[PDB]
UniProtKB/Swiss-Prot annotation, chains A, B, C, D, E, F:
Name of the protein described by the UniProt record: P3(40)
Record annotation: effect of changing E7Q: In CAA-APP; Dutch type
Lineage of the species this protein comes from: Eukaryota, Metazoa, Chordata, Craniata, Vertebrata
Residue(s) at site: Cleavage: K1, L2, F4, F5
Shown part of the complete sequence: 687 to 708 of 770
Phenotype upon changing M20L: Reduced lipid peroxidation inhibition
Domain of life: Eukaryota
Annotated site location: Implicated in free radical propagation: G18
Amino acid sequence: KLVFFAEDVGSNKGAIIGLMVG
Amino acid sequence: KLVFFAEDVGSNKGAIIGLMVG
Amino acid sequence: KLVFFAEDVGSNKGAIIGLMVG
Amino acid sequence: KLVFFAEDVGSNKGAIIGLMVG
Amino acid sequence: KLVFFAEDVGSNKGAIIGLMVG
Amino acid sequence: KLVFFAEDVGSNKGAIIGLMVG
């Protein structure tokens, strides 16, 4: 019996912003 | 018995913004 | 018995915006 | 003068694949 | 004068794959 | 004069893979 599991690889759940200006 | 599992690869669930200006 | 499973690959569930201006 | 430009947003130029077997 | 420019946001130019087997 | 520039945000130019087997 052989099992391979991979999850959440190179995923974005947060926030990525180049820049922010008020 | 062989099992292969992959989930959530290079997916975006968050927020990606180039720039934000008020 | 052989099983292959792949889900949620290069999918967008969040929000992608080039730019935002008030 | 006001200029707004955006390009290549949420676009795929490469290759996306769920799985492959030889 | 006002200039806004954004490029290559959330874009894939490489290769994304869930899994592969020889 | 005002200039806003952003590039290559949340973009993939390399290779992302969940798993691979020989």
